[PDB]
Amino acid sequence: VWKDADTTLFCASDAKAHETEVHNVWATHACVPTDPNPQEIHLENVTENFNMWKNNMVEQMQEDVISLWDQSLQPCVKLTGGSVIKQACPKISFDPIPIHYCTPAGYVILKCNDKNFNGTGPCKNVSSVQCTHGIKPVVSTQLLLNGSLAEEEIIIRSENLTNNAKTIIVHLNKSVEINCTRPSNDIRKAYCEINGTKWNKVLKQVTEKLKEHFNNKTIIFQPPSGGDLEITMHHFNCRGEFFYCNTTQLFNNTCIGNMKGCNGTITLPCKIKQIINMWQGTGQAMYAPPIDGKINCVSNITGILLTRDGGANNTSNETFRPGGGNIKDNWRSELYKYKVVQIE
């Protein structure tokens, strides 16, 4: 039959060789052309155990994205080897594209199709594919952007919910647009627009789903307790600029109870920063000031990273705060239904 195995995967995309956009350039050299007619083979009477938290495919992606940024987003200033390095840091073109990950000869990818698979455990509806779906390498904190939605129910993912040290990944089944803008005309001031009605209805569903897992305890949200700005804020890269958006308004409990007074647009304060703690864990990097003109990008909130407060407590409520952990968890959120096996 086969056994679970680790190997080097190769990538595939629809990258455009003529584009100057950084992801396209990288994909052009690193990836092969995508297959128009992929052959997906479903396997009858097969049970396979998956574990999204122990999946080396995630490690591969992490290295590809690290390699990507290393080639095209070198900073103006950084610390390395007891010296400060000064580099030419021109403005780039930045827009992530979908990357497929594919198995070499002798291997194949098994794909869980259970519409409510939570990431770990047995899968019945298993199919065999040579490549994953198109995955965008969107690096972000707190909110997961431009990802895939859950087919049916909202899915709570966690290696172990009782362990407060383990990140909780909420997989949404309906997207919520986030509309972030640096208005053309403080050049670092920006803002993100969100539909309060859309968001508060979604957030309500999340709590009810969390009640199912925490025995109908009062579900409360709160802003991050502390840490670097990259986490206490919604941190993401848009058109080559690093944004930091306050999400204090996105987790207002008053608006998801059982009255209103908050049904309109939510405008999050944002700031484009030049000095940043790199997500690769390489240290502080310094970038040049933002391009002129109107910087804008409309993204889909497809998931939420949460950490639950711990400590001895039997107050009715359980508290959750935005912020997840590794950027690796962003890759986990998409690769959760895949695993590599070697043929016998």
Partner: peptide, 17 residues
């Protein structure tokens, strides 16, 4: 409580918040 090295993320015991 705990604190993570990477970003300094923290989780405090409820009774000590």
């Amino acid at each position: 409580g705990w604190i993570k090295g990477m970003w300094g993320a923290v989780s405090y015991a409820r009774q000590l918040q």
